[PDB]
């Protein structure tokens, strides 16, 4: 059972009429969908959870539909959000829609026969729908009594300051109608998404019945709570660098790593169980984090992205910046380590103070005399030192390190 | 001051920023409006209360807009209604719109210069409004927290089985936008209606501030509760003479209770307040009910309708039917007196049975013999009598009275 496999990965929060849905999956290929609203330049890690689930369904022969909310992004999903969001402009939303559509596409196969993926956009049907048609044909099927009691919006109806507009209150009906549109258009019988989307999904199941007299299903994937109780890292490399992305996975807590392998990679459950059991009986610290980091970093940023993240990680730890490119240095200045902008000619002592690495020039004196300051890796032990011109690599980068762990990159101006 | 005068008639339930509206009315003509939704093929006496108020404003030099809800009648006003209403089709709503527009027109001056009345229909702007445009441009200004605290819908928001659909819940936004739309189109700065419409009116005052940065006002007229606790009008008394004959209409007013009649002159007539008060002084040994019936019947059904009602009332009181026309007997058949259809050749005994004036032929015989029965106002005491052909007036009508008061109209088949 595909559903059963997803359960042992931890990827099933809830599922409507599980026995019927499972019989439909065993019967043959179904079509399913997940929606993504455009609220930013790019998706982030959280979005991968249902997005990679679409691919898991496709790998079992089913047909995934990835919807971008061209219309619903002009409305705003309130589900489990504490505060009303400001409306975005049509112009901004459209540019975001195109970027998110192009981000989604490489994660699904658009060329594998009958079950090839489909890109969709609900603006196609909401852009020409009259309000009276929407109020009558769709709105009559919704009880405000039930709507105001849904978990996703209940808390917004406590105090009026942090209330909810009629605009965001109507969102649930737009996403409901989406399910009925994709049912009629492509035979979609399953919608998946995170557990916050449950109420938006069941509205689409019910409305699809009332409108199209068809039985469809929903399945939710979990929202991740870390083992310690906690929870942004974008897929766009110009927002989160491949090096920062890689390091984020490297620092995964021991109690989260195997679950995260299940959620964010396509490693078999057997290989994941073998890794956990190797980590268990080996008398060393876990190595799973390195496996997770390579896996997801290659997935999102490719082999080139992976090797650059490794190369930077290696040089930062070794002290040898000779391997690094200019582009490698640009990731460091974006994301990887704290940075400052100093005009050339400064001595190493005033380098430490201005970056908030050393408090005073007198403290920098003893710090530099104690052989505790590296410059691009090579020890420099004398206070009165100035940077040689060769040390400013690619004309604009030198990397300070106090002790072993404290970094600042100076981007000379 | 037009507002003070209306208050002396008891026609003002509530008013917003009253001092400010009063100064605005005193400065010069304003444009004002009232809306009427098509829920039947005719208006009834209730609608007269705000409709005649539109006229009262026009007589003071202001410009009335009478709006018929071609769009809101496709949605359904839930305010202070115990139960969800069934949706009406576009075809039948359009029928009602034109009948109601034609009913309303004679009550206002459409040809008196600058302040000529205007007929409006909110389908002209809602019939083609896109739903996203509606949810964004209008629905963002509406707090759901506030909507569910409107008195008009509180009784519907407690239990799903007596609940409210998203359809009827949104009605408040359409009426709110109407006000803003009429403000921009015509400079409308005032909306009137019954006190049941208060929440719909104040939502339009608010939205007009948000959309057009303009100050507008609202004034409501009371809902009439008769002095004996029962709600006014209750079936209903329709303006359409094919639903309520002018004779039935006139008798309704003739039989007003003395505790109501002076309140009803103020509400349903254009008599001066000074005259109404003078009439109430009667203690010299009341004309009020007759003045009320005369005024409103002339208003709604014209002089001809008034003379018809009086002519039938007198003929029924006197028993002499020679004044009644065939159209007059048709009013009687419609709703004036009990009627029964009978095949020609029935005898007097059977007519009395079939009309339920008598329970059996044996009893009818005695009753006839006792001289209790009139035929077209003439005594007939022969129990074995058959009607004469000349007693079928116009070939089709014969009026029976048993005793001094119990009528039944035979309509010969
Ligand atoms: N799964 C998951 C896990 C984590 C780690 O704990 C963080 C996440 N952050 C997000 N997600 C999940 O990503 C998906 C997209 O997110 S969204 O754009 O906000 N979606 C919406 O706003 C929908 N209303 C879009 C929609 C529009 C039209 C339609 O017809 C159907 C749907 C959702 O299924 C989230 O549950 C996360
Ligand atoms: N005043 C009064 C008194 C009595 C004696 O007790 C009985 C009455 N029965 C009715 N009324 C009054 O007649 C008017 C029409 O009634 S309605 O069609 O139901 N209206 C509606 O449904 C509005 N939503 C129409 C509307 C639409 C668009 C818009 O932009 C503005 C308004 C209302 O002002 C009632 O208060 C009565
Ligand atoms: Na989703
Ligand atoms: Na009204």
Short description:
Chain A is of the alpha/beta class and 413 residues long. Helices cover 47% and strands 11% of the residues of chain A.
Q: What report would you give on this structure?
A:
It is classed as ligase. The entry lists the keywords protein-inhibitor complex, tRNA aminoacylation, ligase. It forms a dimeric assembly. The entry is titled "Crystal structure of E. coli tyrosyl-tRNA synthetase in complex with TyrS7HMDDA". 2 copies of one chain form a homodimer. With 413 residues, the first copy, chain A, is of the alpha/beta class. Chain A has 3 domains: 2-221, HUPs (Rossmann fold); 225-323, Orthogonal Bundle (Tyrosyl-Transfer RNA Synthetase); 337-413, RNA-binding S4 domain (Structural Genomics Hypothetical 15.5 Kd Protein In mrcA-pckA Intergenic Region, Chain A). Helices cover 47% and strands 11% of the residues of chain A. The first copy, chain A, is built from 17 helices and 10 strands. The first copy, chain A, has helices spanning 2-9, 18-27, 45-59, 90-104, 123-126, 131-138, 144-147, 151-154, 166-186, 198-212, 242-250, 254-264, 269-281, 288-318, 326-336, 348-354, 361-369; strands spanning 31-36, 63-68, 118-121, 188-194, 217-221, 339-340, 373-375, 378-379, 397-402, 406-411. In chain A, the strands form 2 sheets. Chain A has a 5-stranded parallel β-sheet, with helices on both faces. In chain A, helix 4 (90-104) links the parallel strand 2 (63-68) and strand 3. Chains A and B meet through helix 6, helix 7 and helix 9 of A and helix 6, helix 7 and helix 9 of B. The site of one copy of the ligand Nc1cc(CO)cc2ncn([C@@H]3O[C@H](COS(=O)(=O)NC(=O)[C@@H](N)Cc4ccc(O)cc4)[C@@H](O)[C@H]3O)c12 has 23 residues of chain A, from strand 1, helix 3, helix 9 and strand 4.
């Amino acid at each position: 059972n595909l559903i059963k496999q997803l359960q042992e990965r931890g990827l099933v929060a809830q599922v409507t009429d599980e026995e019927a849905l499972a019989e439909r999956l065993a019967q043959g290929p179904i079509a399913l969908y997940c929606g993504f609203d455009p609220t930013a330049d790019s998706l982030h890690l959280g979005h991968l959870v249902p997005l990679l689930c679409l691919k898991r369904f496709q790998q079992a022969g089913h047909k995934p539909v990835a919807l971008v909310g061209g219309a619903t992004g002009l409305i705003g999903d309130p589900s489990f959000k504490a505060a009303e969001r400001k409306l975005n402009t049509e112009e901004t939303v459209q540019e975001w829609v195109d970027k998110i559509r192009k981000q989604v596409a490489p994660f699904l196969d658009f060329d594998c026969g009958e079950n090839s993926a489909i890109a969709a956009n609900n603006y196609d049907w909401f852009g020409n729908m009259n309000v009276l048609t929407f109020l009558r044909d769709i709105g009559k099927h919704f009880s405000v009594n039930q709507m105001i009691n849904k978990e996703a919006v209940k808390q917004r109806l406590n105090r009026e300051d942090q209330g909810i507009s009629f605009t965001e209150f109507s969102y649930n009906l737009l996403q409901g109608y989406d399910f009925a549109c994709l049912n009629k258009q492509y035979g979609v019988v399953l919608q998946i998404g995170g557990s916050d989307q449950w109420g938006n999904i069941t509205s689409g199941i019910d409305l699809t019945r009332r409108l199209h007299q068809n039985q469809v299903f929903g399945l939710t994937v979990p929202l991740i709570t870390k083992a310690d109780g906690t929870k942004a890292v974008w897929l766009d490399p110009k927002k989160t660098s491949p090096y920062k992305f890689y390091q984020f996975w490297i620092n995964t807590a021991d109690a989260d790593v195997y679950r995260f392998l299940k959620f964010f990679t396509f490693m078999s459950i057997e290989e994941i169980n073998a890794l956990e059991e190797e980590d268990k009986n080996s008398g060393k610290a876990p190595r799973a984090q390195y496996v997770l980091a390579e896996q997801v970093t290659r997935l999102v940023h490719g082999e080139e992205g992976l090797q650059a993240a490794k190369r930077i990680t290696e040089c930062l730890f070794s002290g040898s910046l000779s391997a690094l490119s200019e582009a490698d240095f640009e990731q460091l200045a974006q994301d990887g380590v704290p940075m400052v902008e100093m005009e050339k000619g400064a001595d190493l002592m005033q380098a430490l103070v201005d970056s908030e690495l050393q408090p005073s020039r007198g403290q920098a004196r003893k710090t530099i005399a104690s052989n505790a300051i590296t410059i691009n890796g090579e020890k420099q032990s004398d206070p009165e030192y100035f940077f040689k011109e060769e040390e400013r690599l690619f004309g604009r980068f030198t990397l300070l390190r106090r002790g072993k762990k404290n970094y600042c990159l100076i981007c000379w101006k």
